[model samples]
Target: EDAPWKKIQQNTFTRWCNEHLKCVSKRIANLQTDLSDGLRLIALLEVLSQKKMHRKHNQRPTFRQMQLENVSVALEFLDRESIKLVSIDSKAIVDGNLKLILGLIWTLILHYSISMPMWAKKQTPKQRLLGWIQNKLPQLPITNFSRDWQSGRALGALVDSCAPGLCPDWDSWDASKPVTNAREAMQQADDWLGIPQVITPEEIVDPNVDEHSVMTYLSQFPKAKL
Candidate 1:
């Protein structure tokens, strides 16, 4: 009689064990999937890291950006001096032989970015023309040097941030360090027309120089496009 009672309870316990085994199997399957996904992700990340390390040696920025870096360095030096110069009387700049400013403005007018939505007709003429040229040239983007001056942003950005002590040994010990300093590299820029001294745009131009001078030098440039 006790055996029959134990037999009934044993069958019910077997049913519970069967359900528990199914749940365990389901969890194991889920774990396997997650583990595979994690391994794939880790492997992908390793390849990306390897590629980035290889690409590091040849990552050069645009000439425009390089010029900006040079100007930034020059601006740092310029800040040390506090004596400000005369602002050009707008009416007299071109009349007094500030041809560089007038030339650049003329270049801007001929450029195509003015049609672009980035510039509205209502905005200043200089900005509109500069915007148009940025679109057409694709190399020289005049984001800085917005106003007209002796050199303008055109001359300033292209010029090297030069000084004797700052870059003491630029000429002699040459090949080993192609770029002794970032500023110097732009100075050595191929056919680079930038001046050696950290002079203002206004200071550089005379009646003889104008945008024609700028285009003559710059137009052939930026062997690499932005």
Candidate 2:
């Protein structure tokens, strides 16, 4: 389960999950083992929906059965909210299957990332987000969310656009060293705008850079400024 792409999704979703989980003073690193107990999973759902589970769950599940029950509660909560989930089950989650776990988180990303926001619709979330990025960085060729963001220049530019004078040396930030560039930009953004670093610089430069994660992080910008 140490596939290249799987690592990318795991890292991306973990950060995305932690970004929301921050409200409850919780965080998770391993998607497979972390959510198996269903505590963090429930916390994430509660954070996103802003509502507690109608039914109670095992707060301290120490057995397999208790873990399964806890996971079922989360899935049930999603069903009640009419959040359509496909090919996902509590058994797979408790089994720590990475693929199904990634799929489940991706489903949440699709639902909450786009649908939760009341941003202008007709255009897809990615399209609208891309439009905003393009508008801010007219000089960059940010036609897509993948390669366009690898250099970290666009991310730095977006941060500077929202908070002018934050990255005064944007012109000198070398794209050749994406890690340093992204880290510096994200640090400034976080310190000044309170935007969480949802994705790491290494992830941005990875060959399997995930579009959804990049979009998820960028989607926070408009909200930060507006």
Candidate 3:
């Protein structure tokens, strides 16, 4: 049976994929199915790595073998990028396995999105990011990048933390009106602090909020007095 978290992870990863693919005019709906042909996978890689795929792959892979070969080509490029993938193969990718596909996308996010610093006392990227947020707000209960932020108060409080008076009346932020809270906080952060709105407020309020996408957005807010 598939795990419950995988659905959330899949949604989150799909959103993150689209965020990068926007520059190249590409998008994906279902991670398990979209990357099957390897075209989107390779294209995503090309965009993230800022270079072309290392090997020639079928532009229009109509056959299974062609799809498999193309997917392999994409993976091989990752090898050259020094991005290590574990226990994932082109065959599995072409087969559209949900867990493995999620794993594959997660690996890509770790390499590309979480590239700030890796030498801080051996903490994982997730830990380092959450630690940063955790240190910033010792009063908030931000254990992860998922539903823990659904109420919008956490993000709004973060905005307040940075500017001190951006969201002056944080206590009045309705717990039920998560979208409004998320929107106001995001808009303020964007207009005032220059933090780009990577994920929209709608996605943040969704029950299945993606971790990588939310983290990607929150990662923009650092403690450098901005």
Best by TM-score: 2
Q: 167-226 in candidate 2: lDDT tens per residue? A: 877877787888888888888888898877777777766667778777767777775543
Model 3 TM-score is: 0.78
Instruction: Write the residue-wise lDDT of candidate 3 on 69-148 in tens digits.
Output: 99989988888878889789998899998888888887887767665343365778888778878877898877989787
Ranking by TM-score: 2, 3, 1
RMSD of each: 33.5, 2.5, 3.7
Tens-digit lDDT track of model 1 for 152-178: 323323332222243334334333332
Q: What is residue 71's positional error in candidate 3, in angstroms? A: 0.8
Count the clashes in each prediction. 8, 0, 0
Deviating ranges (above 4 Å) for candidate 3: 1-6, 116-121, 138-142, 146-148, 162-166, 187-217, 220-226
Structural similarity to truth (TM-score) of each candidate: 0.20, 0.86, 0.78
Error of model 2, residue 73, in angstroms: 1.7
| Root-mean-square deviation of candidate 1 | 33.5
- CA shift of 88, model 1, Å: 39
